[PDB]
Design a protein around this ligand. Structure first.
Ligand code: ZZQ
Length: 822
């Protein structure tokens, strides 16, 4: 039984558990045994939460960042239902009290015993929150539709919970022996090396003597470093590069000088090197698992006596305002001098101080660390910055995690992508971030869900495979039931892969309608219907994908032939009609990042009461160049609409009317006005979003309208101006905002203010986007490579300017954009 769990975990994570043992590594072993006890205590805890609390775990509330409305309510084991008027201000409890008073008459005869489920979703309404604080209610309030909800009793929910049970002495300079290698090139070999603490070098880099591009090369050289061993910080990192010359990089490799047990390291080491794009401090500190093929450097760490890093007690024992809002040496000096007063009157400039403290002087570091332990907790925003690679020191990390704990799950979810990337930076397996992500993922099934996928999605990447795999195994130890739910998901994804593969070959030999019939046959196979049905959508686990409508499924006409999968739910009705797009072949990371940053803008706007009617559809990479997009129904490309087909409702004398006619036919009479509004708001939003983010090559083929008028974007290939992309006003948008008039400066300038608000709001959170992008550098995304990329943001948000200025700046670009418009 314990045996079956293991094989399930193996299949689930994409790596077999035997491989962890085969490593014969105490670091891994400890991480495994430790992290299991932890996840087991969490899982233990959970099985004894009260029912409401279990709901909170299982399906956390989805909330928005007087007026009448019709609601429909039913009770679980029955079809009969009732329609009430309520106020949008009513508590979920008031509604539940009605439900019951209605029932008990149609039946002859306590609201606290119930929670309201959304029909056909893993979504629930509970708490003291007026109805439309719940996203679902408020959402309905807009698209116009009637909320449909099911009274679920406490006995019913608890049944679910049930079914889910399971030192300073050493003064001599540091130096190593470089012995020999085993590599491939054309010319002389060289081995350069430096000691890093983050991005900063601890002293000048040193080099090898020029040998023949030959062997199996030999060196047997002392390389001595311009620093004394006693000054080596905890997180000291030794970084190698190997290249040829007579310029030409071959491989690289890094290691920590202290092991995970704080022991300094001796003596011989074989390093299996990673092939190159010279020195790479950010690169991982464990070796290339491809031992057969990979080049290897063998070194000798001299044995300086056994030595550990001193305990914390031993550590603990041992116009400035004007600058303080890059700095000269002299300034650096003043800051350091004022450290105490920094910790007293500018605690939020911590990051600035840490950047001036001398990491290659053990005495200075001890001073810095002493101030850290009395340091007041910082705001979340400051914590996100402290996770930067610039801050490799784990006492700082511990502090940053310490400050990060007051994250709401919503915030946590909103940054989860980035926190995962930072795991790639971690010098050791057992660490605080890992401990924290696991703990929060265990207290929240939604967080649990996405963490897994973020991790499961990168197992094809050898540098993170082990780390990630070990985390996923830990999590499963913490959630036997959720791992079943997830296998269901990965089983569906496996089938989709096989289906898409068939689609690629077939689509080259034959015509679309034929491949479509073939697809449906393959899908109608027993193994496919079972695999592809009755699951939770990986794009959002509260979305249930029940019955695939084979008849509706097809594939899209682009190189990779992405699949189009429609699902219905009888229990869910209309909002059980959902689609996903399976994509195998393209990298989805770029888009997912893009989609999350827009999502962020929307939350920011909404937190200041600006609702631009955005459309944040799911996008979720699941594996090697494989993931899913959320289908947005009742929409079409501008281009498609501008095919302006005769026979359709939008038959137009001039192409500029096409959109507006379409909108008219979907939105008769007084509905028309609302749709123009929806179009205007969301346009404002996507214009500002594409502009700040440097997303370009927008054309009518990658912009979509929905029948509500809402406009949104697909196919993000390029961002951060990655061919300075202008602001863009398409003539046809302007025309639609202007209600079909040549001049409508009333309508048009309202539109300007929306942009201006959206833009100005984002700037106030400029730093929040910077820190997040900072953290993304860890990803290896090709258009997220360096500083010039983070420069793009600085410039778009005109962050260094004043609001009066920036607005002025933005006003030119926006004008420039209107001029372009015919
Ligand atoms: C691959 O996309 C195409 C490229 C060239 C020509 C046509 C398509 N294409 C297109 S082009 C529209 C498009 O490229 N993408 C869409 C269409 C709807 C979307 N909804 C939510 C999120 N993204 C969406 C993206 N659409 C469809 C199909 C299709 O083959 C098949 C049936 C379902 C809709």
């Amino acid at each position: 039984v314990k045996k079956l769990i293991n094989s399930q975990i193996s299949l689930l994570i994409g790596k077999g558990l035997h491989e962890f043992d085969s490593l014969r590594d105490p670091e891994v072993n400890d991480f495994r045994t430790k992290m299991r006890q932890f996840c087991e205590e969490a899982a233990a805890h959970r099985q004894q939460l009260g029912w409401v609390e279990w709901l909170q775990y299982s399906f956390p509330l989805q909330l928005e960042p007087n007026r009448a409305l019709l609601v429909n309510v039913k009770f679980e084991g029955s079809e009969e239902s009732f329609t009430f008027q309520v106020s949008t201000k009513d508590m979920p409890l008031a509604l539940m009290a009605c439900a019951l008073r209605k029932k008990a008459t149609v039946f002859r005869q306590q609201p606290e015993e119930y929670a309201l489920q959304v029909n056909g979703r893993h979504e629930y309404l509970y708490g003291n929150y007026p109805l439309c604080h719940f996203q679902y209610i408020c959402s309905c309030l807009h698209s116009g539709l009637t909320p449909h909800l099911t009274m679920v009793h406490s006995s019913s929910i608890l049944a679910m919970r049930d079914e889910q049970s399971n030192l300073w002495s050493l003064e001599q300079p540091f130096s190593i022996e470089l012995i020999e290698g085993r590599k491939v090139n054309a010319m002389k070999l060289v081995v350069q090396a430096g000691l890093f603490h983050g991005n900063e070098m601890l002293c000048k880099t040193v080099s090898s003597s020029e040998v023949n591009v030959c062997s199996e090369p030999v060196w047997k050289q002392r390389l001595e470093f311009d620093i004394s061993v006693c000054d080596l910080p905890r997180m000291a990192r030794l970084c190698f590069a190997l290249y040829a010359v007579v310029d030409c990089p071959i491989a690289w490799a890094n290691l920590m000088l202290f092991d995970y047990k704080d022991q300094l390291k001796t003596g011989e080491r074989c390093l299996y090197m990673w092939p190159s794009v010279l020195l790479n401090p950010a690169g991982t500190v464990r070796g290339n698992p491809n031992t057969e093929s990979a080049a290897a450097l063998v070194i000798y760490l001299p044995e300086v006596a056994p030595v550990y890093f001193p305990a914390l007690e031993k550590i603990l024992e041992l116009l400035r305002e004007i600058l303080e809002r890059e700095l000269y040496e002299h300034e650096k000096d003043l800051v350091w001098k004022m450290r105490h007063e920094v910790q007293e009157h500018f605690p939020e400039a911590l990051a600035r101080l840490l950047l001036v403290t001398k990491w290659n002087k053990h005495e200075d570091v001890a001073q810095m660390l002493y101030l850290l332990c009395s340091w007041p907790e910082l705001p979340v925003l400051s914590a996100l910055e402290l996770l930067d690679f610039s801050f490799p020191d784990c006492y700082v990390g511990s502090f940053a995690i310490k400050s990060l704990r007051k994250l709401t799950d919503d915030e946590l979810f909103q940054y989860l992508l980035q926190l995962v990337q930072v795991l790639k930076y971690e010098s050791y397996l057992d660490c605080e971030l890992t401990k924290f992500l696991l703990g929060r993922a265990l207290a929240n099934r939604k967080i649990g869900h996405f963490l897994f996928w973020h991790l499961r999605s990168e197992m094809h990447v050898p540098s993170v495979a082990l780390r990630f795999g070990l985390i996923m195994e830990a999590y499963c130890r913490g959630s036997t039931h959720h791992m079943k739910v997830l296998m269901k998901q990965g089983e569906a994804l496996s089938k989709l892969k096989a289906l898409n593969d068939f689609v690629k070959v077939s689509s080259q030999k034959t015509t679309k309608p034929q491949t479509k019939e073939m697809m449906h046959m393959c899908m109608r196979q027993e193994t496919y219907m079972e695999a592809l049905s009755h699951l939770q959508s990986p794009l959002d686990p509260s979305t249930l994908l029940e019955e695939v409508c084979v008849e509706q499924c097809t594939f899209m006409d682009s190189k990779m032939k992405p699949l189009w999968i429609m699902y219905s739910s009888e229990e869910a009705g209309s909002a059980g009609n959902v689609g996903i797009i399976f994509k195998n072949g393209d990298d989805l990371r770029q888009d997912m990042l893009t989609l999350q940053m827009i999502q962020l803008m929307d939350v920011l706007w909404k937190q200041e009461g600006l609702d631009l009617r955005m459309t944040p559809y799911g996008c979720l990479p699941t594996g090697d160049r494989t993931g899913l997009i959320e289908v947005v129904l009742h929409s079409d490309t501008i281009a498609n609409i501008q095919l302006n087909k005769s026979n359709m409702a939008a038959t137009a004398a001039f192409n500029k009317d096409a959109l507006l006619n379409w909108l008219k036919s979907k939105n008769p009479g007084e509905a028309l006005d609302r749709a123009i509004e929806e179009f205007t708001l969301s346009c404002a939003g996507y214009c500002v979003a594409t502009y700040v983010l440097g997303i370009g090559d927008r054309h009518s083929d990658n912009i979509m309208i929905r029948e509500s008028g809402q406009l949104f974007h697909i196919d993000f290939g390029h961002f951060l101006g990655n061919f300075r992309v202008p602001f863009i006003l398409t003539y046809d948008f302007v025309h639609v905002i202007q209600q079909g008039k040549t001049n409508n400066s009333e309508k048009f300038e309202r539109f300007r203010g929306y942009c201006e608000r959206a833009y100005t709001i984002l700037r106030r959170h400029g730093l929040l986007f910077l820190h997040l992008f900072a953290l993304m550098r860890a990803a290896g995304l090709p258009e997220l490579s360096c500083s010039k990329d983070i420069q793009y943001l600085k410039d778009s948000l005109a962050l260094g300017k004043t609001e009066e200025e920036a607005l002025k700046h933005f006003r030119v670009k926006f004008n420039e954009a209107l001029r372009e418009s015919w």
